[PDB]
């Protein structure tokens, strides 16, 4: 740990720009893999309806597919409303 501390002290006195650059890069690489909002961003990108939601032909055996948009079945964005 002493060698690492001496190296960091010397670099912070000679190349503060490079020290800051490497710190920012390392935090950019590591932090996204730990934040719990990465999956939230993925879900928000999924929830965006760019194209038309083509309906499915009802076979009479689709209990999880809503018949009307306001029916309870189907995805809900209540989590996104309070976010």
Distances in Å between the Cα of 42 and the Cα atoms of 14, 47, 50 are 41, 9, 15
51 binds other proteins (CB under 8 A): yes
Inter-residue contact 65 to 74 (CB < 8 Å): yes
User: Phi and psi dihedrals of 66, rounded to 5?
Assistant: -65, 150
Inter-residue contact 65 to 56 (CB < 8 Å): yes
62 binds other proteins (CB under 8 A): no
22 or 40: CB nearest ligand PEE: 22
Minimum CB separation from ligand PEE for residue 13, in Å? 9
Task: Give the per-residue contact string, 16-45, with ligand PEE (x = CB under 6 A; - = no).
Answer: -xxxxxxxxxx--x----------------
41 binds other proteins (CB under 8 A): yes
């Amino acid at each position: 740990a002493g060698r690492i501390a001496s190296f960091l002290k010397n670099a912070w006195a000679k190349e503060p720009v490079l020290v800051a650059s490497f710190a920012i890069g390392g935090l950019a690489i590591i932090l996204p893999s730990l934040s719990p909002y990465t999956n939230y961003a993925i879900r928000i990108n999924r929830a965006t309806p760019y194209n038309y939601p083509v309906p499915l032909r009802d076979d009479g055996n689709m209990p999880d597919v809503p018949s009307h948009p306001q029916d309870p079945q189907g995805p809900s964005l209540e989590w996104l409303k309070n976010l």
